[PDB]
Amino acid sequence: KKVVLGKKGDTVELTCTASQKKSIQFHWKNSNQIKILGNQGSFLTKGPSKLNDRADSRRSLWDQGNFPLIIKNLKIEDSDTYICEVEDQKEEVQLLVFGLTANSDTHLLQGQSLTLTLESPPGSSPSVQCRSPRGKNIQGGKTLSVSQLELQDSGTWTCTVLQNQKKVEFKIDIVVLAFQK
Amino acid sequence: EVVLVNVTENFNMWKNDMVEQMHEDIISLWDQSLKPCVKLCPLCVGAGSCNTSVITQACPKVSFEPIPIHYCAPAGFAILKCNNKTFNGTGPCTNVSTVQCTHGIRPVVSSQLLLNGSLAEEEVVIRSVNFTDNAKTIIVQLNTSVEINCTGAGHCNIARAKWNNTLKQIASKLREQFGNNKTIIFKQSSGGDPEIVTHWFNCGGEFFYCNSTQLFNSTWFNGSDTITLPCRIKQIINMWQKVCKAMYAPPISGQIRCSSNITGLLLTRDGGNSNNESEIFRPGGGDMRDNWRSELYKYKVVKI
Amino acid sequence: DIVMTQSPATLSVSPGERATLSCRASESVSSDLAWYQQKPGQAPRLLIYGASTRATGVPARFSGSGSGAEFTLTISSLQSEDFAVYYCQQYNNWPPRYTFGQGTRLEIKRTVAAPSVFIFPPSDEQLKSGTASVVCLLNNFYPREAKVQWKVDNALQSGNSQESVTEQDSKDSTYSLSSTLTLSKADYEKHKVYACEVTHQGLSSPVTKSFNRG
Amino acid sequence: EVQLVESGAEVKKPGSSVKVSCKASGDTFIRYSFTWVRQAPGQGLEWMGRIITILDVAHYAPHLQGRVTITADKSTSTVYLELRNLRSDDTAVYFCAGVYEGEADEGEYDNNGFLKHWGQGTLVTVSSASTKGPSVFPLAPGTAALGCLVKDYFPEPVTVSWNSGALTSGVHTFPAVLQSSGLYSLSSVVTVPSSSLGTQTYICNVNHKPSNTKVDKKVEP
Ligand SMILES: OC[C@H]1O[C@@](CO)(O[C@H]2O[C@H](CO)[C@@H](O)[C@H](O)[C@H]2O)[C@@H](O)[C@@H]1O
Ligand SMILES: *[C@@H]1O[C@H](CO)[C@@H](O)[C@H](O)[C@H]1NC(C)=O
Ligand SMILES: *[C@@H]1O[C@H](CO)[C@@H](O)[C@H](O)[C@H]1NC(C)=O
Ligand SMILES: *[C@@H]1O[C@H](CO)[C@@H](O)[C@H](O)[C@H]1NC(C)=O
Ligand SMILES: *[C@@H]1O[C@H](CO)[C@@H](O)[C@H](O)[C@H]1NC(C)=O
Ligand SMILES: *[C@@H]1O[C@H](CO)[C@@H](O)[C@H](O)[C@H]1NC(C)=O
Ligand SMILES: *[C@@H]1O[C@H](CO)[C@@H](O)[C@H](O)[C@H]1NC(C)=O
Ligand SMILES: *[C@@H]1O[C@H](CO)[C@@H](O)[C@H](O)[C@H]1NC(C)=O
Ligand SMILES: *[C@@H]1O[C@H](CO)[C@@H](O)[C@H](O)[C@H]1NC(C)=O
Ligand SMILES: *[C@@H]1O[C@H](CO)[C@@H](O)[C@H](O)[C@H]1NC(C)=O
Ligand SMILES: *[C@@H]1O[C@H](CO)[C@@H](O)[C@H](O)[C@H]1NC(C)=O
Ligand SMILES: *[C@@H]1O[C@H](CO)[C@@H](O)[C@H](O)[C@H]1NC(C)=O
């Protein structure tokens, strides 16, 4: 019943451990039984999944009975339940991938608005809280908006997404321009 | 050798100690025969960080040529042999005998295609520990050999008509297992290590990596005379014996030629939740125990 | 270890003529043999590898041959930019323990030219600091071989001088040499006549240049 | 083709360690092996070791085994040489060099032992001596000879010109010698017309970068 939150574009490592410290046959599949990755003896195999190009393991850990599924450059649609089948046993983990972006990548003026949009996978019910450098707090669901930026909002905002009692953190740099009267 | 009258014995080719024994024997043979110039093996746990074990040694160019191995009874045991010409390797065998030794088995290391092995006596046979599990390898045993001729100059040749006949026979067997209304599709390897994505084998002491896309690109129950597979000889390889990398010296012969007989295949099925009435099969392999299993499926060792 | 030996140590060749350089190995290195060219103050330049294969940018007049334990580099017609030091290198062993020859210096053969000899007494400023350096200069001679001896009050000196020699001159193909005699102010003032005696193929008799202190 | 740029000169006391670097630009880093070769003043080339860059595996000369380490940072395309427990006889120019090994990322590796590409070299001076600028003394004058004696400096190198670069003809600046004191000494001489000694002024310009010293010395009859 494991839940793992991921950040869009980041890398996540999903764990799978065997009872003994030895390299044995393992395989990762998704909820639709599509093969992601596994081993054949001392070799890695990759299945016909959409993660193919971005999926890998750590073979230096196999001899210790650890068979991770590493997914790089995470996409929202990577969100799914993944199952590691090892020594007649199934280890299940739900991956949820989130993205958080500002309305513009350009500098903003004092008094102008900022809107942050959380990209979420289907079925997820995340709550979000963002805090600016001055301590300005905003919270919501899919979209968080600040009506008027202050000069003191310029800098790194920190946004926490809460899902299944787990949280992931986004840092977003916002520039608010100073001016002379 | 000596038929056991009215004896029924259970066999399980997927749990056979003869396979494990042969595997350890071939690992030893290769470790003493084909020495890498450099060998790199991971070593982890403790303190936190990982480490890499590195061995460097003289690496003589040698021409590897597998000799048949006979496995005879280990002290305190007997070898039983299933005589049923079409036996799937897992279940009761009604015609069983005791033998002094196995037949001569050439310990060929390869992926995808099984070379220089034994042919099925009757029809093509497919074997798996669990056909319903898409992650489990399907071992195919042909009843007719197909020549594959390879050169260090960078390719392997296969007769297109022969291969196509072979594919039709395999597909028929696969739809007999998965459904008579199934379209059978062969596709290239979906990915992984090069030794697994290509038809990989050793010829004249060199490691060949042959693109098998042309062998596995057809649809059944829905060209040129010769199929020519492009190949690459490599010096840096992923080892089959264990999770290590090895480097070998470049070739020294300008006339590397091998001609083998394809006698079997290692396949996997895509599977997955699909209401579509077709099945996709791709070349597989990598675990050489499956190679040994393809020959030892009809034998077992029992306590006397 | 595999010892590489080159001969000769120095090769003197007239411009436009052929040069043949030799490299010998203490055991067979097959064809795993490279040749390098090095000019003063520069990195080596790969000329030949695999005993006979010219590297890119190497003119056809450079030719490598041989196998096993005996190799030759041939330069068919020497150009001004070909005069340099040449090294051979074996890379046949594994584990790798690659080794170089000690080099052959290829220099320009010209006619004999006697040195012009000059002597310089210590400056008053250096004498003020308590030391006396006396400099003997041999200018623009050929060949490189020369003998310089210091005599103080006709006493042959030993162990108190050091020599330095220039690279071969790019214009006239000559060499120059300095010999510097060093003594303390006290020892310097204990003697009268300071003389350097120069012996060279270009001179009929040894040349002496001298001065009396003060 | 790759271009190799090495780090600057080093000066070390015996017993110290040194780490020199070499940045490889212009081609794919992991398709090359890299080698370090050194050259002591007046001596030949000495092979130190070679790294199989893609495998991160290095092999070393027997005489150095134990105190040399060669590494490579794939992220910055930089090769490093570390030499430990330095001795005065480790004084040399250290060259980074390399050669293309084939499509290494696809498992092709020729294991070439020759060296196509070379760095500019890094002087490493190992000595008990401390950095110091030279004393410059005059070597007072058809043809006349004059010069400057450039004495008691450390480490190498020193640069010498005449009349701020306006005079180059007839100049001979000798390679330095190492004195028994551990300090270097050289002379620069030039031959000029005798008739000139009474009109043309001659100044030797001496630059020693390590001590940031610069000296101009007028040389007169
Ligand atoms: O590692 C020393 C080894 O190198 C050789 C030639 O490959 O000599 C080199 O190193 C010497 C000591 O540093 C130098 O004097 C010499 O000029 C240089 O070529 C071998 O002689 C020696 O075994
Ligand atoms: C069992 O197989 C053997 C071959 O080993 C054969 O000779 C024998 O006839 C078979 N038994 C039956 C019942 O046919
Ligand atoms: C293989 O064994 C089965 C019983 O398990 C037997 O009925 C059958 O005749 C055998 N196969 C063939 C084709 O002889
Ligand atoms: C394999 O054959 C045996 C009879 O020898 C049979 O009992 C068993 O069910 C077969 N397995 C499959 C999956 O066909
Ligand atoms: C090989 O087996 C196939 C069935 O899979 C059959 O149609 C064919 O006739 C057999 N060929 C031989 C040589 O027995
Ligand atoms: C066979 O594989 C299927 C598919 O994964 C699985 O549901 C079933 O449990 C397997 N059968 C056995 C006996 O392991
Ligand atoms: C393979 O080579 C054999 C001879 O060793 C030849 O008989 C056969 O025709 C060849 N098969 C091809 C090229 O498919
Ligand atoms: C094989 O391939 C040919 C075309 O190359 C195709 O028409 C035919 O149906 C296939 N079957 C056999 C047995 O050749
Ligand atoms: C094999 O060749 C096919 C067709 O040219 C190509 O699409 C595929 O990527 C190749 N497979 C490799 C290089 O493993
Ligand atoms: C796959 O096969 C089809 C016909 O069966 C052919 O037209 C196509 O070129 C093949 N693709 C590859 C990758 O070789
Ligand atoms: C392959 O099998 C054919 C038919 O049995 C035979 O003629 C040939 O000798 C075999 N080739 C090899 C390499 O074993
Ligand atoms: C298959 O056997 C033939 C003939 O004995 C041999 O020449 C060839 O090398 C073998 N192939 C392999 C991959 O071992």
Keywords:
heterotetramer, A: 181 residues, mainly beta, Immunoglobulin-like, eight-stranded mixed β-sheet, 17 strands, elongated, D: 221 residues, 2 domains, five-stranded antiparallel β-sheet, 19 strands, 0% helix, binds a molecule of 2 linked components (GLC-FRU), binds 2-acetamido-2-deoxy-beta-D-glucopyranose, T-cell surface glycoprotein CD4 (chain A), adaptive immunity (chain C), Ig_C1-set (chain C)
Describe the model.
The complex is a heterotetramer of chains A (181), B (304), C (214) and D (221). Chain A is mostly beta strands and 181 residues long. Chain A folds into two domains: 1-98, Immunoglobulins (Immunoglobulin-like, Sandwich); 99-173, Immunoglobulin-like, CATH 2.60.40.10. Chain A has no helices and 17 strands. Chain A has strands at 2-7, 12-14, 26-30, 35-40, 43-46, 55-56, 69-71, 80-86, 90-102, 108-109, 114-119, 127-131, 137-140, 143-146, 155-163, 166-174, 176-177. In chain A, the strands form four sheets. In chain A, strands 1, 3, 4, 5, 8, 9, 11 and 14 form an eight-stranded mixed beta sheet that branches. Chain B is of the alpha+beta class and 304 residues long. Chain B has one domain (1-304): Beta Complex (HIV Envelope Protein Gp120, Chain G), CATH 2.170.40.20. In chain B, the strands form four sheets. In chain B, strands 8, 9, 10, 11, 12, 13, 14, 15, 16, 19 and 20 form an eleven-stranded mixed beta sheet that branches. Chain C is elongated and about 65 Å long. Chain D has two domains: 1-128, Immunoglobulin-like; 129-221, Immunoglobulin-like (Sandwich), CATH 2.60.40. At the C-D interface, strand 4, strand 5, strand 10, strand 12 and strand 13 of C face strand 5, strand 12, strand 13 and strand 17 of D. Bound molecules: a molecule of 2 linked components (GLC-FRU) and 2-acetamido-2-deoxy-beta-D-glucopyranose (11 copies).
